[PDB]
Amino acid sequence: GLYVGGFVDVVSCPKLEQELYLDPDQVTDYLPVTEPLPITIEHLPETEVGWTLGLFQVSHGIFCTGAITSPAFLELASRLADTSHVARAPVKNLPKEPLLEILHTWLPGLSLSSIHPRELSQTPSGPVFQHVSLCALGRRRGTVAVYGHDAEWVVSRFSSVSKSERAHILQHVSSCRLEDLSTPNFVSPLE
Numbered sequence: 001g002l003y004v005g006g007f008v009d010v011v012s013c014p015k016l017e018q019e020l021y022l023d024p025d026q027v028t029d030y031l032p033v034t035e036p037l038p039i040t041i042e043h044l045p046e047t048e049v050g051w052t053l054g055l056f057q058v059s060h061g062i063f064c065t066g067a068i069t070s071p072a073f074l075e076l077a078s079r080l081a082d083t084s085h086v087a088r089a090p091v092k093n094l095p096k097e098p099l100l101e102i103l104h105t106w107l108p109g110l111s112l113s114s115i116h117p118r119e120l121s122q123t124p125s126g127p128v129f130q131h132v133s134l135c136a137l138g139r140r141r142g143t144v145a146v147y148g149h150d151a152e153w154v155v156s157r158f159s160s161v162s163k164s165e166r167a168h169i170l171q172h173v174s175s176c177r178l179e180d181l182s183t184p185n186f187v188s189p190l191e
């Protein structure tokens with residue numbers, strides 16, 4: 001099981017337009033979110049690879065911590081990290097932890113899917129957020145996603161998160177066991 005952390009772009013995938021980047025301040029009222037949301041690849045519902053453990057408002061923006069739990073995805077990505085020249089081409093030579101470096105490089109973006117700002121201004125009936133996506137394109141704000149084996153290590157990699165914010169974040173993360181989370185639906189494309 002891997003952990004992922006970083007600051008999200010807040011998007012509401014629209015039907016008419018190509019993309020809509022929300023200002024984080026439009027959703028802070030609905031944070032924090034400590035119930036598990038799916039983590040997918042590029043907003044594709046069939047690519048669940050894990051679950052969020054917390055969405056938090058911090059000084060520097062909206063910070064997300066999640067767990068990558070899909071066995072099919074972890075096995076595939078680990079094999080690629082040790083054997084694929086394509087996966088290793090855009091990363092530094094001979095990394096000590098190739099899996100982490102390859103996710104860090106190939107999926108640097110975290111995007112939080114929100115309902116349209118129309119309902120955010122009023123009183124929403126249902127959930128405001130649907131999922132978080134690991135993304136290869138469309139990154140707007142600075143900083144990139146961090147992947148690691150230890151949650152504390154992931155969050156501490158962000159100097160823009162204070163000691164107080166890290167302690168609040170890690171309280172919820174440690175309060176959840178990944179065993180009683182359902183298996184994500186990701187299927188290896190090689191099948």
Ligand SMILES: O=C(O)c1ccc(NC(=O)c2cccc(CC3CCCCC3)n2)c(Nc2ccccc2)c1
Binds near residue numbers: 041077080106107189
């Ligand atoms: O079915 C097909 O024809 C097909 C073709 C291309 C695909 N993926 C891509 O083109 C692509 C681009 C950027 C980032 C990623 C994610 C990342 C996962 C594990 C380490 C290496 C890559 N995939 C995918 N999807 C996919 C591939 C590998 C892992 C996960 C999803 C499918």
